[PDB]
Design a protein around this nucleic acid. Structure first.
Ligand SMILES: [Mg+2]
Ligand SMILES: [Mg+2]
Ligand SMILES: [Mg+2]
Ligand SMILES: [Mg+2]
Ligand SMILES: [Mg+2]
Length: 118
RNA sequence: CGAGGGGAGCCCUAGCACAGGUGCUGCAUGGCCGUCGUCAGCUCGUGCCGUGAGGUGUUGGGUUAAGUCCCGCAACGAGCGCAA
């Protein structure tokens, strides 16, 4: 169940352009291909489940960034049914570091959106 | 008993405190004026890069008289300026 679709077809993305810190995962080339690994995907993926479960049941606002091209439509739907904040189009320049200015822009958003009722 | 000690202030016969330069110095100052310029630029808070001056905001594309304001972009935004 948790390893069927992960093992069905999950290979082939941007080949012969690869940062060689990923080199311990590709195990076979046949003609011009580079295979994304499966068994280490299961183990590191399981470590990620047991990390975000134990870290996230306390009530952490676990944010996720899907700004590439086509994870925008999946982040934009899964974020409302998830209950956690998100980002739509691009990462804002210094979103966490300039949270004073961005958060006081949200403080402006708390009173500009109340103008519609008046 | 005022035209007697004189009396509120003033006047002086002539004094005396201090005043007095359309002469330099804006190469000691405050207010100023002209100037580039009615072109569209100049700064600040936060955060990043860089040992640093500093850059990033204020870069690239589009167009307007215009830093007027959109897309991406480590930038998000404010103040004086084109306006009202
Ligand atoms: Mg400048
Ligand atoms: Mg600069
Ligand atoms: Mg720009
Ligand atoms: Mg102009
Ligand atoms: Mg402006």
């Amino acid at each position: 169940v948790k390893e069927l679709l992960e093992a069905g077809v999950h290979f082939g993305h941007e080949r012969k352009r690869w940062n060689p810190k990923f080199a311990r995962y590709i195990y076979a080339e046949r003609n011009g291909i580079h295979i994304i690994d499966l068994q280490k995907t299961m183990e590191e993926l399981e470590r990620t489940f047991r990390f975000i479960e134990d870290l996230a049941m306390r009530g952490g606002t676990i944010l996720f960034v899907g700004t590439k091209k086509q994870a925008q439509d999946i982040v934009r739907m899964e974020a409302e049914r998830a209950g956690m904040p998100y980002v739509n189009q691009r990462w804002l320049g210094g979103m966490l570091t300039n949270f004073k200015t961005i958060s006081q822009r949200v403080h402006r958003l708390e009173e500009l959106e109340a103008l519609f009722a008046s």
